[PDB]
């Protein structure tokens, strides 16, 4: 499914995200725009090896399993697979232990780039959440 952006806020604010350690919910939307253009097929694959998935663009070699990549972990405990549907349930219980970890939303490159530092009322401008 491609996201309408409010469409997503709305999602995300649902279902605790705004906030959530310490990240308010601009950084969540502005993250899935420049990662995947809000689209939850979205997949790249890496040098490495790796492969990102999903509209948050959570990568293998450390959250899921996608069974192709060299010395992977998966500690979400998911299939990368389930990272890709329609519905967010699992991405977002992956993205919330992902900003756990001691890198917080760092974790994301998009976010380090994009959003970092950035006047983000724009992404959620229009949304009424
Ligand atoms: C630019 C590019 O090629 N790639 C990006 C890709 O980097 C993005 O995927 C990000 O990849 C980085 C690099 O692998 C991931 O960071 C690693 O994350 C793990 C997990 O948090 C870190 O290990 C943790 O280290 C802490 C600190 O020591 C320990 O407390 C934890 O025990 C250890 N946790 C586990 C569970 O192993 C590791 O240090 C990080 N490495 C670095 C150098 O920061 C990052 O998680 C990952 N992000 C996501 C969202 O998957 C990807 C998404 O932006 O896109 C591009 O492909």
Redesign the pocket.
């Known amino acids: 499914k491609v996201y309408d952006r409010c469409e997503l806020a709305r999602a995300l604010k649902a279902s605790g995200m705004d906030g959530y350690a310490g990240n308010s919910l601009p950084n969540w939307v502005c993250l899935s725009k420049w ?1 995947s253009s809000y689209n939850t097929q979205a997949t ?1 694959r ?1 040098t490495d090896g790796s492969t ?1 998935y999903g509209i ?4 293998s ?3 899921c399993d996608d069974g192709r990549t060299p010395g992977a ?1 998966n ?1 979400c405990g998911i299939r990368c697979s389930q990272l890709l549907t329609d519905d967010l349930t699992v991405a977002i219980r992956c993205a919330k232990r ?1 900003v756990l ?3 917080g939303i760092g ?4 976010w380090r780039l994009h959003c970092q530092n950035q006047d983000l009322r724009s992404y959620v401008a229009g949304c009424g959440v």
């Open positions: 990662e790249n890496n990102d948050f663009q959570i990568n070699r450390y959250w972990k500690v992902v970890d001691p890198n974790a994301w490159v998009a």
